Amino acid sequence: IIFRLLLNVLMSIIAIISYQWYEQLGIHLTVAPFSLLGIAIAIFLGFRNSASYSRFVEARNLWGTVLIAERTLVRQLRNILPAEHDAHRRIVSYLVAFSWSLKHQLRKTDPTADLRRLLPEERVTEILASSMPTNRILLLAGNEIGQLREAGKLSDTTYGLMDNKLDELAHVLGGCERLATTPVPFAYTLILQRTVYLFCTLLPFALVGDLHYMTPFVSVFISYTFLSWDSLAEELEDPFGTAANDLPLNAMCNTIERNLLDMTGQHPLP
Amino acid sequence: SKIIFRLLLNVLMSIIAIISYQWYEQLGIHLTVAPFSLLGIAIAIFLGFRNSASYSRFVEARNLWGTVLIAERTLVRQLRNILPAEHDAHRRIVSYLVAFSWSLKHQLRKTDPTADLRRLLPEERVTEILASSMPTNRILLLAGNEIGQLREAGKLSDTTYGLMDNKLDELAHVLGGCERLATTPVPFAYTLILQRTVYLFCTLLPFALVGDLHYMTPFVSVFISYTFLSWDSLAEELEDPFGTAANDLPLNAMCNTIERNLLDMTGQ
Amino acid sequence: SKIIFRLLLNVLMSIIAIISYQWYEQLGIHLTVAPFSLLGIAIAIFLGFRNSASYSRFVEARNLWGTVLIAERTLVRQLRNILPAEHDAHRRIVSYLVAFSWSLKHQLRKTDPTADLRRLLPEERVTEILASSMPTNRILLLAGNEIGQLREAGKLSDTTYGLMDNKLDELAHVLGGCERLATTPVPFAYTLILQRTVYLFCTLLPFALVGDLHYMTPFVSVFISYTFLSWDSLAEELEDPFGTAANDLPLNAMCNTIERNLLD
Amino acid sequence: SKIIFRLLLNVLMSIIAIISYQWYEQLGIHLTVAPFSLLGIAIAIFLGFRNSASYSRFVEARNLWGTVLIAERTLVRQLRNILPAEHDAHRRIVSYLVAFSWSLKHQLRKTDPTADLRRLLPEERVTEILASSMPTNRILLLAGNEIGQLREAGKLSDTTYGLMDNKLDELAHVLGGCERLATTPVPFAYTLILQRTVYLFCTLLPFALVGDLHYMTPFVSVFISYTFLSWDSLAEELEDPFGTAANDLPLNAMCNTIERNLLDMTGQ
Amino acid sequence: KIIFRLLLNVLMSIIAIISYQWYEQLGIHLTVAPFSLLGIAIAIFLGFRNSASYSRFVEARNLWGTVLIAERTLVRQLRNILPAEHDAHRRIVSYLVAFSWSLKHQLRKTDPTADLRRLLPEERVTEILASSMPTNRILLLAGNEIGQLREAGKLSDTTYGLMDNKLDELAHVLGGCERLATTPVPFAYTLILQRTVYLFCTLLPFALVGDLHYMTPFVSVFISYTFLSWDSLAEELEDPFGTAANDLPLNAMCNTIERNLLDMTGQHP
Ligand SMILES: [Zn+2]
Ligand SMILES: [Zn+2]
Ligand SMILES: [Zn+2]
Ligand SMILES: [Zn+2]
Ligand SMILES: [Zn+2]
Ligand SMILES: [Zn+2]
Ligand SMILES: [Zn+2]
Ligand SMILES: [Zn+2]
Ligand SMILES: [Zn+2]
Ligand SMILES: [Zn+2]
Ligand SMILES: [Zn+2]
Ligand SMILES: [Zn+2]
Ligand SMILES: [Zn+2]
């Protein structure tokens, strides 16, 4: 990815050799048109990166919500039903399974190992048999809260109170799904990039007349700026993508798992 | 896309510029990139904002359909958790929800939903739905009738009824939101003004440049024009979210997803 | 609208510049483009942001009316699902909700809502409503009176009463929001800076463009003028979305749509 | 406002730049336009973003007060619909709400609220409230006390008590919101950055413009200065939305409207 | 510390002035117009980024306000619904205050043991310090007070709901501040950005010098002051929980909250 900076620092060299056998032909290149084009592209990059950042933020918010919902849900389970600890274990397993399964869903990885670690094989087989595993997990948690309801351990009021949290989690799932099926531009988001590329490659060809052989330095500077901003944009557009960062999601799933364990007395150890 | 018309027309004007540059002093006419830069800058800025609007709105449509999926899922989930034995009810309400999805899709797309409705629901109900001048809202009303029936039966308390009714509300905010998007577009005096200015600017910019560029104008003028037009475009696409075009929302696939999801949660 | 006038104006100013250009020499006036480029780009930016704010106001107003339709719909639906056999209260409540929509429309469009109220409600409480300084809110209080008259003696429990009350508050938030957008506008430094700032820039512009544009000059000055005037003007009507202009909200159509929906 | 006392100054800096223009090379100082175009554009952008923040702050305030009006309206409405015979509660709670509006308004305006309280409330509770360092919150507490008495009296079920408590939450969020906007101020730095960067830029501009504009320097300099200073002064009271200046929130009018409304919604 | 590299680019401007015919000998030329373009782009990017940072600051402050609000309404409900259970008022309040301080320390990455021991009995403090999220544990303990309050019939499930909603508000606050703490602005943003501003500011005089001559350092220091100030302000806003000048007075907010909860329970400091 330093390859294009390099690439045509070399166009800045070809630019100069190119500048020299010159005016026999009609080619001329001033700075003012590429300044206009460059400002326009900069503006477009500004807006675009803004949208990308907005997507990133929304993802981080949704996952934050996961953590929050699962914490409050477990808290409620402890405050309302302080004695039902096998239900605690199960429901917590389900929430943690929801988190991991979600990560694996967004990252197109296999959730099988994490599920098999957290849940009994019958319910793991069922969830993996489904094409929408995470929703099946939520459904199963719901089944647990409902079982607590028909047993008379939960009134419908407090059942409501926990159902609200499961809603929160559902909204999250849907939101992350929408953000994953995205982005919305049908690979036009790409189109701009090659516009930036062609602009950065033709730029030293237009500065050369004025900057002479300071050209590679100024051109690699400007190219660095635009290209870096573009790549930042593309990585923000794709928070759950193939070339995205492992740390957000993994730490979030670990964080919540730890939290839940700690809340349920499974932590800490005797 | 259609964008080849802008670029080749611009090439041709660029050529007219090349050949007719020698007749500028004799008419008096000469041109500076300087004023043109100002113009194209103010335009670049406007386009940016107008695309903020278009994108925001596109996104809002995606959000709404997302809310369909979420609300229906949770509604079925609640039905299972509260009334796990009422499977007939389950599949009645499911059928209405899927019908709501399809009818919504059909409405935003101006297609006859009679076939899908009669595929999901018994004929009497289809009649009730098509009798209304607002079929999708009456679909909500019929799902609401089922939930209500469950309430009067005593199977649902007013609390749990309320819990489900909230989901019906979410669905209603969806229907309204989609209708509002459908009928209220981004004021396209935006698209009017911007199209005029951008077009005139792209046809005038080989004339904004010519003297300076010569043998290298179709390449640079096309490059600039293309940038503005490929950019001016992201409105074409980000404002037909309910259209059938390749770039609009795959409402067919979304509805399929919803139906498959609600049938997955009911064992069929 | 009258943009054309101020465009024509630019054009005459432009010809003046054309005939006066090298008499700048005899007057000691030199004017290059670069400072006007700066000023014009700053103005463009500012016009960009203001326009964005306007559009936002427009969008939220629209949303508030969308919320009207949605709240009233669900409220009726709840009435038919919880109390399917009390059509009496249903027609009363619906007539109130519709009178609410029209009264609100007339309130934001400064107009007399008497006729439509009479058309939708019985004379007695049309006089009660017109007696109030805030009719729309009075209408809401009446619809609430209907629902309370449904809680009182057993048909609605507290819970389901809550379910309908919530929707009445959705509506009340709409009322408050619309009042906020209508009563408190944008702070009138808004074209109170952008009016001459933009036209003064557009009329002084050909004086600086004549140097280099020479003969082709007015075309470009009317072009730039068109752009800035047309954008500062798109703020014209997006800032008053309850206004009567073309790009303002078709509130009349929206109410019709609302009561068509409730009467179906 | 007193912005013209910066325009006259600018005209003086312009005439000084005119009379000193070609001691420039005789002093060794050269000033082209391009760096001031760059600098001016950057400043313009930053001004645009700052002014945006300011605008959004003012709007937030407006929304807050709108929420006060709404929440109080709905609270009184609920009181009349749930407890139509309890005109005592109507009276005392409405007084408490109006008192909340005024207390908040005086709190934001840094004025004494006691006259309005004595006008609206009996004195033992007024002294109670004035004794507390957070009076407004205390007024919410008291309103809550009465809704709580209605609950314990069995006139309100826990459900209905919840339905009004949600309105007290709405009001509390408002109080916390206004307190936030007032105590937490704007990040000042934007103002120290733009005040001197704009002022300095406006005064230094004619020295870089005199070269090419010559005698036309004061007009163009005072114009550009007028634009940047007018945009900066457009911000000035928006980042302080609770101020007494003419172009900020009519909190008097708003609180009069509120009291007017709550008395209209009770029959006075 | 902006004065350090203000002086530096002043010095680098002096390096440009006192000197440079070297390119003319060398063949290297540098005009303003390309640096104008680059400077405008950078200015745009700085604008957007600063805007985002500000948004983050505003989010933080908003969240803390929500702490104060949620706690207030929680105490209010506790007084209005259970006026006689005053020991519970004091305990729950001490929990809410402990929550505020522990959150402060959590965002500041400091030890909350002193403030915990100040507000809570040693057993609870020990129970809390063992948790991976002490604030969460605090919420869980307050909830246990409210839940205990539910099971001897002192609160109905509905009213227990009403308060639990406030605990959910608080938990949303916690999750959001946690997210603003763990979510740095992506480094790639300042990696490009601020280095690009420093480099732009130090290279600018070399390009301004050909047209400005001896005026270079004044225009260069002006521009550098602008860009660096704007940038620095953005830095400052991105870390709203830091001890730096432009950042949240979490101490002031915490004792404002404590004074408030003490005000509402008739108690004095
Ligand atoms: Zn446990
Ligand atoms: Zn642990
Ligand atoms: Zn939902
Ligand atoms: Zn079933
Ligand atoms: Zn609603
Ligand atoms: Zn009926
Ligand atoms: Zn001429
Ligand atoms: Zn409300
Ligand atoms: Zn009364
Ligand atoms: Zn009495
Ligand atoms: Zn709250
Ligand atoms: Zn107490
Ligand atoms: Zn929550």
Residue numbers in the entry:
A (entry chain E): 24 to 293
B (entry chain A), D (entry chain D): 22 to 289
C (entry chain B): 22 to 285
E (entry chain C): 23 to 291
Wording from the paper:
Human bestrophin1 (hBest1) is a Ca2+-activated Cl− channel essential for Cl− transport in retinal pigment epithelium (RPE). Although the structure of hBest1 is still unsolved, two Best1 homolog structures, one from bacteria Klebsiella pneumoniae (KpBest) and the other from chicken (cBest1), have been previously reported. Overall, the channel is a pentameric assembly with a single ion-conducting pathway, which varies in diameter along its length and is constrained at two narrow points: a “neck” contributed by three residues (I62/I66/F70 in KpBest and I76/F80/F84 in hBest1/cBest1) on a transmembrane helix, and an “aperture” formed by a single residue (I180 in KpBest1, I205 in hBest1, and V205 in cBest1) on a cytosolic helix. Here, by electrophysiological and structural analyses, we show that the neck and aperture in hBest1 are both indispensable Ca2+-dependent gates, and their dysregulated opening by rationally designed or patient-derived mutations causes Ca2+-independent leak and elevates Ca2+-dependent channel activity.
